[PDB]
Amino acid sequence: VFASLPGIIFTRSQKEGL
């Protein structure tokens, strides 16, 4: 969800790892 939104992609990084 975060990835799609303009918000920070921090969460996305966690999903994959670091």
Side-chain angles (χ1 to χ4, degrees):
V1 182
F2 268 61
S4 312
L5 266 114
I8 67 179
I9 62 101
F10 183 98
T11 41
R12 215 214 186 180
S13 203
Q14 175 167 47
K15 186 195 182 65
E16 163 59 27
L18 207 167

PDB file of all heavy atoms in Angstrom:
ATOM      1  N   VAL A   1       0.825  -1.203   0.000  1.00  0.00           N
ATOM      2  CA  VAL A   1       0.000   0.000   0.000  1.00  0.00           C
ATOM      3  C   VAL A   1       0.862   1.257   0.000  1.00  0.00           C
ATOM      4  O   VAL A   1       0.657   2.163  -0.807  1.00  0.00           O
ATOM      5  CB  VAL A   1      -0.940   0.035   1.220  1.00  0.00           C
ATOM      6  CG1 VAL A   1      -1.821   1.275   1.179  1.00  0.00           C
ATOM      7  CG2 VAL A   1      -1.786  -1.228   1.276  1.00  0.00           C
ATOM      8  N   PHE A   2       1.828   1.305   0.912  1.00  0.00           N
ATOM      9  CA  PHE A   2       2.722   2.452   1.018  1.00  0.00           C
ATOM     10  C   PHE A   2       3.441   2.705  -0.304  1.00  0.00           C
ATOM     11  O   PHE A   2       3.587   3.849  -0.735  1.00  0.00           O
ATOM     12  CB  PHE A   2       3.745   2.227   2.133  1.00  0.00           C
ATOM     13  CG  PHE A   2       3.303   2.758   3.468  1.00  0.00           C
ATOM     14  CD1 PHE A   2       2.159   2.270   4.077  1.00  0.00           C
ATOM     15  CD2 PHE A   2       4.033   3.744   4.111  1.00  0.00           C
ATOM     16  CE1 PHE A   2       1.749   2.756   5.305  1.00  0.00           C
ATOM     17  CE2 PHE A   2       3.629   4.232   5.340  1.00  0.00           C
ATOM     18  CZ  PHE A   2       2.486   3.739   5.936  1.00  0.00           C
ATOM     19  N   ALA A   3       3.891   1.630  -0.942  1.00  0.00           N
ATOM     20  CA  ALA A   3       4.593   1.734  -2.214  1.00  0.00           C
ATOM     21  C   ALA A   3       3.756   2.485  -3.244  1.00  0.00           C
ATOM     22  O   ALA A   3       4.259   3.367  -3.942  1.00  0.00           O
ATOM     23  CB  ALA A   3       4.954   0.350  -2.733  1.00  0.00           C
ATOM     24  N   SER A   4       2.478   2.131  -3.334  1.00  0.00           N
ATOM     25  CA  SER A   4       1.574   2.769  -4.282  1.00  0.00           C
ATOM     26  C   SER A   4       1.379   4.243  -3.939  1.00  0.00           C
ATOM     27  O   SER A   4       1.368   5.101  -4.823  1.00  0.00           O
ATOM     28  CB  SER A   4       0.221   2.053  -4.290  1.00  0.00           C
ATOM     29  OG  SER A   4       0.388   0.649  -4.391  1.00  0.00           O
ATOM     30  N   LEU A   5       1.226   4.529  -2.652  1.00  0.00           N
ATOM     31  CA  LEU A   5       1.032   5.899  -2.190  1.00  0.00           C
ATOM     32  C   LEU A   5       2.336   6.687  -2.260  1.00  0.00           C
ATOM     33  O   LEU A   5       3.428   6.123  -2.316  1.00  0.00           O
ATOM     34  CB  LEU A   5       0.496   5.905  -0.757  1.00  0.00           C
ATOM     35  CG  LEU A   5      -1.024   5.991  -0.609  1.00  0.00           C
ATOM     36  CD1 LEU A   5      -1.576   4.707  -0.008  1.00  0.00           C
ATOM     37  CD2 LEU A   5      -1.410   7.190   0.244  1.00  0.00           C
ATOM     38  N   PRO A   6       2.221   8.023  -2.254  1.00  0.00           N
ATOM     39  CA  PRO A   6       3.381   8.918  -2.314  1.00  0.00           C
ATOM     40  C   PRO A   6       4.204   8.886  -1.030  1.00  0.00           C
ATOM     41  O   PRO A   6       5.353   9.325  -1.008  1.00  0.00           O
ATOM     42  CB  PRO A   6       2.753  10.300  -2.512  1.00  0.00           C
ATOM     43  CG  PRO A   6       1.385  10.181  -1.934  1.00  0.00           C
ATOM     44  CD  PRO A   6       0.949   8.764  -2.188  1.00  0.00           C
ATOM     45  N   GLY A   7       3.609   8.361   0.036  1.00  0.00           N
ATOM     46  CA  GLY A   7       4.303   8.280   1.308  1.00  0.00           C
ATOM     47  C   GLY A   7       5.659   7.615   1.187  1.00  0.00           C
ATOM     48  O   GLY A   7       6.000   7.071   0.136  1.00  0.00           O
ATOM     49  N   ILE A   8       6.436   7.659   2.265  1.00  0.00           N
ATOM     50  CA  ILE A   8       7.763   7.056   2.274  1.00  0.00           C
ATOM     51  C   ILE A   8       7.696   5.573   1.928  1.00  0.00           C
ATOM     52  O   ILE A   8       6.727   4.890   2.264  1.00  0.00           O
ATOM     53  CB  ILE A   8       8.448   7.222   3.644  1.00  0.00           C
ATOM     54  CG1 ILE A   8       7.704   6.416   4.710  1.00  0.00           C
ATOM     55  CG2 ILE A   8       8.510   8.692   4.030  1.00  0.00           C
ATOM     56  CD1 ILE A   8       8.325   6.515   6.086  1.00  0.00           C
ATOM     57  N   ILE A   9       8.731   5.079   1.257  1.00  0.00           N
ATOM     58  CA  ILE A   9       8.790   3.676   0.869  1.00  0.00           C
ATOM     59  C   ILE A   9       9.567   2.854   1.893  1.00  0.00           C
ATOM     60  O   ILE A   9      10.088   1.784   1.579  1.00  0.00           O
ATOM     61  CB  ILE A   9       9.444   3.501  -0.515  1.00  0.00           C
ATOM     62  CG1 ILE A   9      10.886   4.013  -0.490  1.00  0.00           C
ATOM     63  CG2 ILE A   9       8.636   4.231  -1.578  1.00  0.00           C
ATOM     64  CD1 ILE A   9      11.915   2.910  -0.369  1.00  0.00           C
ATOM     65  N   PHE A  10       9.639   3.362   3.118  1.00  0.00           N
ATOM     66  CA  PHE A  10      10.352   2.675   4.190  1.00  0.00           C
ATOM     67  C   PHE A  10       9.761   1.290   4.434  1.00  0.00           C
ATOM     68  O   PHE A  10      10.487   0.296   4.508  1.00  0.00           O
ATOM     69  CB  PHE A  10      10.296   3.499   5.477  1.00  0.00           C
ATOM     70  CG  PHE A  10      11.072   2.892   6.612  1.00  0.00           C
ATOM     71  CD1 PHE A  10      12.352   3.335   6.908  1.00  0.00           C
ATOM     72  CD2 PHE A  10      10.523   1.879   7.381  1.00  0.00           C
ATOM     73  CE1 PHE A  10      13.067   2.778   7.951  1.00  0.00           C
ATOM     74  CE2 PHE A  10      11.235   1.319   8.424  1.00  0.00           C
ATOM     75  CZ  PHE A  10      12.509   1.769   8.710  1.00  0.00           C
ATOM     76  N   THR A  11       8.439   1.229   4.559  1.00  0.00           N
ATOM     77  CA  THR A  11       7.751  -0.034   4.797  1.00  0.00           C
ATOM     78  C   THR A  11       8.098  -1.059   3.723  1.00  0.00           C
ATOM     79  O   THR A  11       8.324  -2.232   4.022  1.00  0.00           O
ATOM     80  CB  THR A  11       6.223   0.157   4.832  1.00  0.00           C
ATOM     81  OG1 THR A  11       5.817   1.062   3.798  1.00  0.00           O
ATOM     82  CG2 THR A  11       5.776   0.692   6.184  1.00  0.00           C
ATOM     83  N   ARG A  12       8.139  -0.611   2.473  1.00  0.00           N
ATOM     84  CA  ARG A  12       8.458  -1.491   1.355  1.00  0.00           C
ATOM     85  C   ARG A  12       9.814  -2.160   1.561  1.00  0.00           C
ATOM     86  O   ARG A  12       9.964  -3.362   1.339  1.00  0.00           O
ATOM     87  CB  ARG A  12       8.460  -0.704   0.044  1.00  0.00           C
ATOM     88  CG  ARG A  12       7.938  -1.497  -1.143  1.00  0.00           C
ATOM     89  CD  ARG A  12       8.653  -1.110  -2.429  1.00  0.00           C
ATOM     90  NE  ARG A  12       8.064  -1.757  -3.599  1.00  0.00           N
ATOM     91  CZ  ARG A  12       8.513  -1.587  -4.837  1.00  0.00           C
ATOM     92  NH1 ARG A  12       9.551  -0.795  -5.066  1.00  0.00           N
ATOM     93  NH2 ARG A  12       7.924  -2.209  -5.849  1.00  0.00           N
ATOM     94  N   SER A  13      10.798  -1.375   1.987  1.00  0.00           N
ATOM     95  CA  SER A  13      12.142  -1.891   2.219  1.00  0.00           C
ATOM     96  C   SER A  13      12.123  -3.012   3.253  1.00  0.00           C
ATOM     97  O   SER A  13      12.821  -4.015   3.108  1.00  0.00           O
ATOM     98  CB  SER A  13      13.069  -0.767   2.684  1.00  0.00           C
ATOM     99  OG  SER A  13      14.426  -1.083   2.424  1.00  0.00           O
ATOM    100  N   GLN A  14      11.319  -2.832   4.297  1.00  0.00           N
ATOM    101  CA  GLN A  14      11.210  -3.827   5.356  1.00  0.00           C
ATOM    102  C   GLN A  14      10.607  -5.123   4.825  1.00  0.00           C
ATOM    103  O   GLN A  14      11.036  -6.217   5.193  1.00  0.00           O
ATOM    104  CB  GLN A  14      10.356  -3.288   6.505  1.00  0.00           C
ATOM    105  CG  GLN A  14      10.096  -4.308   7.602  1.00  0.00           C
ATOM    106  CD  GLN A  14       9.532  -3.681   8.861  1.00  0.00           C
ATOM    107  OE1 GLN A  14       8.603  -2.875   8.805  1.00  0.00           O
ATOM    108  NE2 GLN A  14      10.094  -4.048  10.008  1.00  0.00           N
ATOM    109  N   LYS A  15       9.609  -4.994   3.957  1.00  0.00           N
ATOM    110  CA  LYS A  15       8.947  -6.155   3.373  1.00  0.00           C
ATOM    111  C   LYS A  15       9.959  -7.078   2.701  1.00  0.00           C
ATOM    112  O   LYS A  15       9.856  -8.300   2.798  1.00  0.00           O
ATOM    113  CB  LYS A  15       7.893  -5.709   2.357  1.00  0.00           C
ATOM    114  CG  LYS A  15       7.060  -6.852   1.803  1.00  0.00           C
ATOM    115  CD  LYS A  15       6.304  -6.436   0.553  1.00  0.00           C
ATOM    116  CE  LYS A  15       5.434  -7.566   0.026  1.00  0.00           C
ATOM    117  NZ  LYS A  15       4.350  -7.924   0.982  1.00  0.00           N
ATOM    118  N   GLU A  16      10.935  -6.484   2.023  1.00  0.00           N
ATOM    119  CA  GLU A  16      11.965  -7.254   1.336  1.00  0.00           C
ATOM    120  C   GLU A  16      13.129  -7.563   2.273  1.00  0.00           C
ATOM    121  O   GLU A  16      13.846  -8.546   2.087  1.00  0.00           O
ATOM    122  CB  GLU A  16      12.471  -6.492   0.109  1.00  0.00           C
ATOM    123  CG  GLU A  16      13.792  -7.015  -0.430  1.00  0.00           C
ATOM    124  CD  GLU A  16      13.723  -8.476  -0.827  1.00  0.00           C
ATOM    125  OE1 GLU A  16      12.617  -8.947  -1.166  1.00  0.00           O
ATOM    126  OE2 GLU A  16      14.774  -9.149  -0.799  1.00  0.00           O
ATOM    127  N   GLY A  17      13.311  -6.715   3.280  1.00  0.00           N
ATOM    128  CA  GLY A  17      14.390  -6.913   4.231  1.00  0.00           C
ATOM    129  C   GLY A  17      14.993  -5.605   4.705  1.00  0.00           C
ATOM    130  O   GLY A  17      14.403  -4.902   5.526  1.00  0.00           O
ATOM    131  N   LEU A  18      16.172  -5.278   4.187  1.00  0.00           N
ATOM    132  CA  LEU A  18      16.856  -4.046   4.563  1.00  0.00           C
ATOM    133  C   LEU A  18      17.006  -3.118   3.362  1.00  0.00           C
ATOM    134  O   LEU A  18      18.021  -3.143   2.667  1.00  0.00           O
ATOM    135  CB  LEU A  18      18.233  -4.364   5.150  1.00  0.00           C
ATOM    136  CG  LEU A  18      18.793  -3.340   6.139  1.00  0.00           C
ATOM    137  CD1 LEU A  18      19.988  -3.915   6.883  1.00  0.00           C
ATOM    138  CD2 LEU A  18      19.179  -2.058   5.417  1.00  0.00           C
TER     139      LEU A  18
END
